[PDB]
Amino acid sequence: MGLPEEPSSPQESTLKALSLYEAHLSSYIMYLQTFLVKTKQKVNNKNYPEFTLFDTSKLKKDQTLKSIKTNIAALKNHIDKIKPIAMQIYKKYSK
Amino acid sequence: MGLPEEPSSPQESTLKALSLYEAHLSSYIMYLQTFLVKTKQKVNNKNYPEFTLFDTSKLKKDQTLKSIKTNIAALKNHIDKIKPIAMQIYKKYSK
């Protein structure tokens, strides 16, 4: 069924909507990172693209609506780095 | 968009079809595990269900069609342990 879709942002900016969205984004990053690491293992030519592993030290741990919104930003910025690479490696190796 | 769907098994039992399926299954497990760990952090009542973290030492590293098929089995057995828990925690906390 191909790679999973990036989670969609809730309409509702409630603590629970945003907390769930943070969890999905973290989970989606881990799917993409795992896919990139496992695909590197199977075809490990020196050409294999370079990716940042997400640094969880950039995530606030305190459950504030403010800290959740800040984490969402950090996760979205990381997705923008790795999603295009994941999608290119998926195509390269499903060819 | 809810939790992602478990990857579907290819029709084709080719090395490439099975290797890609192994990568998706590993990636899907990491999505579910991350979702379970992040959801435990947000609601950490003593009731929170108990899950096995996947042991990558149970995975063969040698790219044999035989070793890939064996890894697929191990990953599918782990999904059967954690998918129902992930789906229940998703509902509990999207309530």
Numbering used by the authors:
A (entry chain A), B (entry chain A): 24 to 118
Paper text:
The crystals were in space group P41212, with one molecule per asymmetric unit. The fold of BBA14 is formed by two α-helices, designated αA and αB, comprising 27 and 30 residues, respectively. The α-helices are connected by a 20 amino acid loop region; thus, αA and αB are placed in parallel. Additionally, there is an N-terminal loop region comprising 15 amino acids; given that BBA14 is a lipoprotein, this loop likely serves as a flexible region that connects the folded region to the cell membrane. BBA14 and the antitoxin epsilon from S. pyogenes showed high overall fold similarity (Cα root-mean-square deviation of 2.90 Ǻ) but only 20% amino acid sequence identity. Although there is a noticeable structural variability at the loop regions, the α-helices that in the S. pyogenes antitoxin are responsible for the interaction with the toxin are largely conserved. In addition, the predicted structure of BBA14 (all the predictions were done before the crystal structure of BBA14 was deposited in the Protein Data Bank (PDB)) corresponded very well to the crystal structure of BBA14 (Cα root-mean-square deviation of 0.63 Ǻ).
In the current study, we focused on the previously poorly characterized lipoprotein BBA14, which is known to be highly immunogenic protein recognized by sera from Lyme disease patients, but which does not have sequence similarity to any other known proteins in other organisms and is one of the 10 members of PFam143. Localization studies for BBA14 and BBG25 have indicated that BBA14 is surface exposed, but BBG25 is most likely attached to the outer membrane and faces the periplasm.
